[PDB]
Structure formats: C-alpha cells, structure tokens
C-alpha cells in the first residue's frame, strides 16, 4: 500500500461520488423543469381558449345583432 | 484466474469509459472542423 496507490483509490472513489452527487442534482433540477413544462401546457390551452373567447365576446354581440337585421 | 474473475468487470468498465471518452473527443474534433469551415 504505497501512499500514492491509496491516493489513487481515493481518487476513483471521489470521482464516483462526484458523479453520483451530480446525478442527484440533475434529477432535482429535472423535477423543476417538469413542473414548468406542465405549467406551459396548461397555459397554452388556456391562452388559446382566451384568445378565441375574447375575440368572440368582443365582436359576436354586434355581429349577431346585425345578422338578425338581414 | 479468480482474481481476474473479480477484476474483469472493472477492466471492461475501464475499457468502456475509455471508448466513450475517445468517441466524444473525435466527435468534438469534427465539430471544431465544421466551426473552422464556417
């Protein structure tokens, strides 16, 4: 057991632990990214519906009223 | 024999790591060549 051999063994162990910690951190970040992704889908649906319904709410009243005069 | 039976997964893993690093280096080299062409 040379000091340098023990240092090498601790080096391999340290590399493995560092990759493991990076894996946990990346997974924890991916959870937040998933949350933002779900919010983005809900908001896409909501905003397209709001676009359609707002356009209709602004115009349809007068347009229907004028079509009733034809 | 049995010593190698215990060390064989380590040798295979080291070879796999080396091949992965070498492939990544070649990939990056080709990307750098494309950058220089640009």
């Amino acid at each position: 057991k040379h000091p340098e051999v023990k240092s090498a063994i601790e080096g391999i162990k340290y590399i493995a632990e560092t990759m493991k910690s990076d894996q946990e951190s990346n997974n924890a970040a991916a959870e937040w990214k998933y949350v933002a992704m779900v919010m983005d889908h809900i908001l896409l649906g909501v905003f397209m519906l709001v676009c359609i319904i707002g356009t209709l709410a602004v115009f349809a009243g007068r347009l229907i009223e004028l079509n009733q005069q034809g | 024999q049995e010593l190698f039976n215990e060390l064989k997964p380590a040798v295979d893993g080291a070879n796999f790591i080396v091949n992965h690093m070498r492939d990544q280096n070649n990939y990056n080299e080709e990307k750098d060549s494309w950058n220089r062409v640009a």
């Binding site: 023990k6 063994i9 391999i12 162990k13 590399i15 493995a16 990759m19 493991k20 894996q23 | 215990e6 060390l7 997964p9 380590a10 295979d12 893993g13 080291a14 796999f16 790591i17 992965h20």
Partner: peptide, 24 residues
C-alpha cells in the same frame, strides 16, 4: 480485498452512468 471491491464498484458505477448517458 475491501479496497479493490470498492474500486470495482466505483468503476462499474462510472461505466453504467456513461452507458445511460449514451442511451439518453
């Protein structure tokens, strides 16, 4: 040989992580 066993475990973990990254 506990030191060798831990070294093999570390190397195998690193290889498995790189393989998973390759699949990803």
């Amino acid at each position: 040989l506990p030191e060798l066993r831990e070294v093999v475990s570390s190397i195998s973990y690193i290889a498995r992580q790189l393989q998973e990254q390759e699949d990803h």
